[PDB]
């Protein structure tokens, strides 16, 4: 009964991710941008999400609004190797679960995630 959601504009899956939740025993879902993802997520009730920030075209912070929109029980996690600290800011205080401090590899990520799905079992 695990189901995570992952964003970002680059390959199918994110690195490291993939062999880690095929680890853990869950069920993630990549997308490719903010308009994959929303309509993935106006249906599929993710209980948590994680956006990138690779190298799209249709912002991010705004997007942060649309997960607890229609998802305020869901987590957002929102985590990423390219752009800058003031990013993280710039979203984990609108409603997202802070900035994974550990990229190219989400190991961290796993810890989090455990806690993330904690709001909903």
Do not use: C, Q
Not at 31 to 48: G, H, Q
Not at 51 to 60: A, Q
Not at 72 to 82: A, E, L, N
């Amino acid at each position: 009964m695990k189901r995570v959601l992952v964003v970002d504009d680059e390959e199918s899956i994110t690195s490291s991710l993939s062999a880690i939740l095929e680890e853990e025993g869950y069920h993630p879902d990549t997308a490719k941008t903010l308009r994959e993802a929303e309509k993935k997520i106006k249906e599929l009730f993710f209980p948590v999400i994680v956006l990138d920030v690779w190298m799209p075209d249709g912002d991010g912070v705004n997007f942060i609004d649309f997960i607890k929109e229609n998802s305020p029980d869901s987590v957002v996690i929102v985590i990423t190797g390219h752009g800058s600290v003031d990013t993280a800011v710039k979203a984990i205080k609108k409603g997202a679960y802070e900035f994974l401090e550990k990229p190219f590899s989400v190991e961290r990520f796993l810890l989090t995630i455990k806690h993330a799905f904690e709001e909903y079992s």
